[PDB]
């Protein structure tokens, strides 16, 4: 007979296989569609997650209740040292999908990248690209220019190979991360010319993104272990006097379908899934050589973005950084992937220009009360330590 009262199902079937992700680094499954009438440009970058903080600004939204008043919002900080371009790839269209036919590298590669191709680097002979490099010194590199001409003639999608400089962060890891970044722009000949001219050169994040732009963040979520149904799916707890456990589901299916079905909630692994969160607005792109990259027009204090005592379980942000409104998936120290938007925005909430007024820099290791070390000393006075 029918269920006595109505209620929606617990959870969504769209994120259905609740398994661990295949790869630790996030994966870009689609790129924005190309327009040949625009100048050549990149479409993605990568960085590392530092933490969160608080800001204050005044809203601009006619008709709203908080119009022309101050608001408090939470933000996220991403540490983004520049990337180095190493090579490019070409793709062609087939009745079975896209496939790659060539890839051409640069002459010199750093030890950061070469560690990626090894699992015991400390005792190897480190010969990863030794024979490939000699192709540049033979016949004026005719074999290198032959492959470039092939891409100009047959390929219709061009992507670049780039890696992070992980030695500029406080992380203990020495092995860099590598990915492919598509080039959207004018012509296939233009894409190859632009891509090759960037060989073994650094690229800064301010040349890719800008302020007041909506972007997407791709990463793997925080991991929990083996988890029961109550927390994994959100089912009602059973009464207090239930024998043999009360954190379960009471009925896992009717009689005659005669199998446990795929739509019932059961205990298993939770967390560490691949996710793609969209529509995050960029508030600030700060430079690493600026000594006042956390100061505004109405707040003239000379200070940087790092809180007093440093970010917890992370070091200090000594490089360029991007400030994003809200939250993103992933724990601290984890590699983030930033991608341009696939959507069109006309909402008057995504077209707003943001001007900041104050940025919190107090300690997050406790109930911090001062913004700078000088201010704390001025308030307290003189201590026995100062002699």
């Amino acid at each position: 007979s029918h269920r006595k009262y109505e209620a929606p199902r617990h959870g969504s079937l769209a994120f259905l296989p609740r398994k661990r992700a295949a790869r630790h680094r996030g994966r870009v499954k689609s790129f924005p569609k190309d327009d040949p009438k625009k100048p050549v440009h990149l479409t993605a970058a990568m960085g590392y997650k530092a933490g969160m903080t608080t800001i204050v600004r005044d809203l601009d939204r006619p008709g709203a209740k908080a119009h022309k008043k101050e608001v408090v919002e939470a933000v996220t900080i991403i540490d983004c040292p520049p990337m180095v371009v190493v090579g490019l790839v070409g793709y062609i269209e087939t009745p079975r999908g896209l496939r790659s036919l060539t890839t051409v590298w640069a002459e010199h590669l750093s030890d950061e990248v070469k560690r990626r191709f090894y699992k015991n680097w400390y005792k190897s002979k480190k010969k990863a690209f030794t024979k490939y490099a000699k192709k540049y010194a033979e016949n004026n590199g005719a074999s290198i220019t032959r492959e470039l001409e092939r891409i100009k003639k047959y390929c219709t999608v061009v992507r670049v190979l780039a890696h992070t400089q992980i030695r500029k962060t406080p992380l203990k890891q020495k092995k860099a991360h590598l990915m492919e970044i598509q080039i959207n722009g004018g012509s296939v000949a233009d894409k190859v010319e632009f891509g090759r001219s960037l060989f073994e050169k650094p690229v800064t994040i301010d040349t890719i993104f800008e302020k007041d732009e909506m972007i997407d963040v791709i990463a793997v979520t925080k991991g929990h272990g083996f988890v029961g149904v109550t927390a994994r799916w959100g089912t009602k707890k059973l009464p207090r006097k239930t024998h043999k456990g009360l954190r379960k589901v009471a009925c896992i299916g009717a009689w005659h379908p005669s199998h446990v079905q795929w739509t019932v909630a059961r205990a298993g692994q939770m967390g560490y899934h691949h996710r793609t969160s969209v529509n995050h607005k960029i508030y600030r792109i700060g430079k690493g050589d600026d000594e006042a990259n956390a100061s505004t027009e109405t707040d003239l204090t000379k200070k940087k973005i790092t809180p007093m005592g440093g970010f917890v379980r992370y070091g200090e942000v000594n490089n360029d950084y991007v400030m994003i409104k809200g939250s993103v998936p992933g724990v601290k120290k984890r590699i983030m992937t930033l991608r341009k938007s696939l959507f069109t925005h006309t909402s008057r909430k995504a077209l707003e220009k943001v001007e900041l007024k104050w940025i919190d820099t107090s300690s997050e290791f406790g109930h911090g009360a001062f913004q700078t070390a000088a201010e704390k000393k001025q308030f307290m006075g003189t201590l026995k330590k100062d002699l």
């Binding site: 209620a7 209740k65 008043k69 101050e70 608001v71 408090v72």
Partner: protein, 135 residues
């Protein structure tokens, strides 16, 4: 039309059905006992609940015998559950209290004892006139 304020912003709700709050006007009632909330949706096993500034159906349990055994509309004016606004400040009062109104929104009494929250004053102009210290 059904009486529930238009344009109210999201806030923490501290008073579910079955709670008794104080009466804060001179109508003769002492306490109010909540039986419904004027905007609640539908969900299995979820009690309706309200906060500062929204209409409620209630009965009086102590007061003049002319007001007992009846159902009156009412508006909540202060609550003891902390909550925040868009300026990021968490605030809370010392007790829970409300006043008696009619479906159109006019107050039955004429005076209010104690402070009231800003949400109640902004949404119901009649309560604003009789209020003293606001927030």
């Amino acid at each position: 039309k059904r009486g529930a304020p238009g344009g109210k912003l999201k806030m923490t709700l501290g008073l579910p059905v079955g709670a008794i709050m104080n009466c804060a006007d001179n109508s003769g009632a002492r306490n109010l006992y909540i039986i419904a909330v004027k905007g609640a949706g539908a969900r299995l096993n979820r009690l309706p609940a309200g906060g500062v500034g929204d209409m409620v159906m209630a009965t009086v349990k102590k007061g003049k015998p002319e007001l007992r055994k009846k159902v009156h509309p009412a508006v909540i004016v202060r609550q003891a559950k902390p909550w925040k606004r868009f300026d990021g400040v968490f605030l809370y009062f010392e007790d829970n209290a409300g006043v008696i109104v009619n479906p159109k929104g006019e107050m039955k009494g004429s005076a209010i004892t104690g402070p009231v929250g800003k949400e109640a004053a902004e949404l119901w102009p009649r309560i604003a006139s009789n209020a003293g210290v606001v927030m």
